[PDB]
């Protein structure tokens, strides 16, 4: 089962991820998109500073204008790289969602609402990730984690 759970956080949320992001690690984020949303993002970061801004290994950015999309990217030394855009977005204003990010050796895999959504190859070594940030127009119900070290 998921552990290290956070309930109903204030957004923006910035929290230390409780263990290393080894292959098989799961980050599970349940929430809903508010009626007025333009975009939100989930960022897996190397550090927590907002200024100068911490590197973002994996930026997962649902956008809601027109037909919507999900933009993924990486921020290194305050510069964004090439966007990878997934156009068939499952997210909808006023609807709840579950995001499951799984770390693999060479990429992240993301499923939304129980269906595979996208892959994103590592551009920063995942061992450098220590922080989860959630920003923008989104209402988070819970955040939970699964690590290979979890006891039960
Ligand atoms: Na940003």
Numbering used by the authors: 14 to 165
Text from the published report:
Tandem-repeat-type galectins, like Gal-8, contain two distinct CRDs that are covalently connected via a peptide linker. In the present study, we used different conditions to crystallize the Gal-8 N-terminal CRD with its linker, and five structures could be solved. The N-terminal CRD prefers sulfated and sialylated glycans, whereas the C-terminal CRD prefers blood group A/B. In particular, the N-terminal CRD strongly binds to sulfated and sialylated glycans.
The best structure, structure 1, allowed 152 residues (Asn7 to Gln158) to be identified with 1.08 Å resolution. This is the best resolution for the Gal-8 N CRD available to date. Electron density of the first four residues in the linker region (Ser154 to Gln158) was clear, indicating that this part of linker forms stable secondary structure under conditions of our crystallization. In structure 1, four residues (Asn7, Gln9, Asp156, and Gln158) were seen to interact with each other via ionic interactions and hydrogen bonds. This structure was solved with the crystal being soaked in 20% (v/v) glycerol for approximately 1 min prior to data collection. In structure 1, glycerol was found to replace lactose in the carbohydrate binding site.
